Amino acid sequence: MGSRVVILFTDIEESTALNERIGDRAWVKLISSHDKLVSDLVRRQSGHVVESQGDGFMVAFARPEQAVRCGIELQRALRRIRVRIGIHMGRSVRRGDGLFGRNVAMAYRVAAQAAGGEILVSQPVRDALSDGIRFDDGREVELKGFSGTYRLFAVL
Amino acid sequence: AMGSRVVILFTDIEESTALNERIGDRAWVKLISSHDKLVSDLVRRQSGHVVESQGDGFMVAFARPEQAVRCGIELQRALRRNAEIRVRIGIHMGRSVRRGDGLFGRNVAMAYRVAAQAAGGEILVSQPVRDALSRSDGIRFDDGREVELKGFSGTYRLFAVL
Numbered sequence A: 001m002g003s004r005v006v007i008l009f010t011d012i013e014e015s016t017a018l019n020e021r022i023g024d025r026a027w028v029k030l031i032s033s034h035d036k037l038v039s040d041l042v043r044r045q046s047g048h049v050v051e052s053q054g055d056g057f058m059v060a061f062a063r064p065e066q067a068v069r070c071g072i073e074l075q076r077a078l079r080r081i082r083v084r085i086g087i088h089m090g091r092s093v094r095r096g097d098g099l100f101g102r103n104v105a106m107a108y109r110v111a112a113q114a115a116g117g118e119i120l121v122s123q124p125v126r127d128a129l130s131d132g133i134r135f136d137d138g139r140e141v142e143l144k145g146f147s148g149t150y151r152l153f154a155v156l
Numbered sequence B: 001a002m003g004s005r006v007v008i009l010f011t012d013i014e015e016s017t018a019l020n021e022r023i024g025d026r027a028w029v030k031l032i033s034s035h036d037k038l039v040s041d042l043v044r045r046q047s048g049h050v051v052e053s054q055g056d057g058f059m060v061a062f063a064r065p066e067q068a069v070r071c072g073i074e075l076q077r078a079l080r081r082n083a084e085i086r087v088r089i090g091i092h093m094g095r096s097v098r099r100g101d102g103l104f105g106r107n108v109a110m111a112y113r114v115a116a117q118a119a120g121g122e123i124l125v126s127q128p129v130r131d132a133l134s135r136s137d138g139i140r141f142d143d144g145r146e147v148e149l150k151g152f153s154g155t156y157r158l159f160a161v162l
């Protein structure tokens, strides 16, 4: 239920191991920096950071091309830690300043399937972008909490 | 040293995604709204603070470990009376850093992993929490079990509240 929204999750790979290695002082510095970078890039594509998960973010966009372009630019900027990015779209409930519903959970699982450095999108996102964006042929996976399988597409 | 000492409690609903898929978004939103208010109310009764939400769970801060455990116990009692959702609870203490409306640092991450280890319906606490509550006349623990926690080297003994 709810309004249609594109949901993007970012997540740092193995952030606990990282925190343990470099220590809390360096980690807070790092994540503050990362937060500012992500916020900047999200805003450039007219997105809004909805919520923090500590070593990652939940971001809302009106259009799928905005989300994917944001993901592309974030990976580019990081190459200048490894981050996984997943993107899904569908109706979700935007209540208080949070997002809820099965399509939020699905975006979350799509991000969880992504490798560090990868941008993964669900089939609805892929099908909506058939403007400067190329995809692989997809991979079929089971997603925790959902029945059956889903084809997820990596951005090239 | 960086950070203020705090007791961190995480709650998490077991298999919330599958639950959401069963009951639908409308009923889910109503359910988690009710859950949010239940947790918030019980937390404030033990002088705690809900720091942040993880959708189907919360990060909560307490000054004292007795407060966190009493809260956990009361929450499980409330959830039993209500019953269907099962909530896992994990508690750890140490210094952590506040940034915005969230807590950061290895001891937050540790609390998170202690919670992840807990079964639905269970309260697990780390060894420092158990040790801090040795003298308590009301709080009782089991003998503990050794685990390894993602992101951390070595092993850690975790204790269930009885």
Ligand SMILES: Nc1nc2c(ncn2[C@@H]2O[C@H](COP(=O)(O)OP(=O)(O)OP(=O)(O)O)[C@@H](O)[C@H]2O)c(=O)[nH]1
Pocket (backbone or CB within 6 Å): A011, A012, A013, A014, A015, A016, A017, A052, A053, A054, A055, B052, B053, B054, B059, B102, B103, B104, B108, B109, B112, B150, B151
């Ligand atoms: N501030 C804040 N931190 C959170 C929240 N939810 C989770 N965390 C933190 O997120 C971290 C755990 O993230 P994970 O991604 O599971 O851990 P990881 O070590 O990165 O492992 P992988 O991503 O699986 O490689 C812990 O530090 C948690 O304390 C939140 O809502 N707010």
Ligand SMILES: Nc1nc2c(ncn2[C@@H]2O[C@H](COP(=O)(O)OP(=O)(O)OP(=O)(O)O)[C@@H](O)[C@H]2O)c(=O)[nH]1
Pocket (backbone or CB within 6 Å): A051, A052, A053, A058, A098, A099, A100, A104, A105, A108, A144, A145, B012, B013, B014, B015, B016, B017, B018, B053, B054, B055, B056
């Ligand atoms: N609103 C909100 N939701 C979050 C946040 N972090 C994670 N989530 C949600 O948390 C849910 C996934 O939680 P999990 O505990 O991994 O899923 P689960 O199905 O309960 O699985 P188990 O706990 O392993 O049994 C998804 O619905 C995510 O969208 C957050 O910061 N804010």
Ligand SMILES: [Ca+2]
Pocket (backbone or CB within 6 Å): A011, A012, A013, A014, A015, A055
């Ligand atoms: Ca991570």
Ligand SMILES: [Ca+2]
Pocket (backbone or CB within 6 Å): B012, B013, B014, B015, B016, B056, B057
């Ligand atoms: Ca859960």
